[PDB]
Amino acid sequence: FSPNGKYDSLYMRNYATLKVKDELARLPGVGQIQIFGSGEYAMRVWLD
Amino acid sequence: AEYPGANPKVIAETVATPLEEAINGVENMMYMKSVAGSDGVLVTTVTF
Numbered sequence: 001f002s003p004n005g006k007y008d009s010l011y012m013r014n015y016a017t018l019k020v021k022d023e024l025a026r027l028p029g030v031g032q033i034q035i036f037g038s039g040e041y042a043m044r045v046w047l048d
Numbered sequence: 049a050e051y052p053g054a055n056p057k058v059i060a061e062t063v064a065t066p067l068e069e070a071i072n073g074v075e076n077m078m079y080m081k082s083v084a085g086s087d088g089v090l091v092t093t094v095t096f
């Protein structure tokens with residue numbers, strides 16, 4: 001979490017995916033790691 | 049796995065890393081190796 005509002009759920013979910021998830025799956029006894037909240041990064045082209 | 053025309057660094061980052069993340073949730077594994085060549089081919093050996 002960001003208690004000061006500096007980061008929203010999207011940034012932190014992708015931060016967990018890119019810097020937390022893999023380093024946690026290396027631990028022993030971990031079968032599954034699941035992320036809940038927001039969504040993956042994606043290139044959004046909002047047309048007019 | 050195959051990633052035609054992709055540089056081995058790209059194959060290692062975008063292919064090998066997520067398969068290793070998934071495979072880490074296997075039991076009785078001793079060590080995992082990934083070799084990605086300029087032939088576009090990635091081989092990941094999982095030794096138990």
Ligand SMILES: CCCCCCCCCCCCO[C@@H]1O[C@H](CO)[C@@H](O[C@H]2O[C@H](CO)[C@@H](O)[C@H](O)[C@H]2O)[C@H](O)[C@H]1O
Nearest residue numbers: 009013014017021032033034035036037038039040041
């Ligand atoms: C913090 C909540 C923990 C709940 C513990 C889980 C046990 C509950 C009974 C089993 C059902 C869980 O079912 C679970 O549903 C979630 C949705 O939340 C799915 O989650 C899926 O959708 C969510 C929502 O977009 C994505 O963030 C996620 O990446 C994707 O995998 C999981 O893939 C599945 O494992």
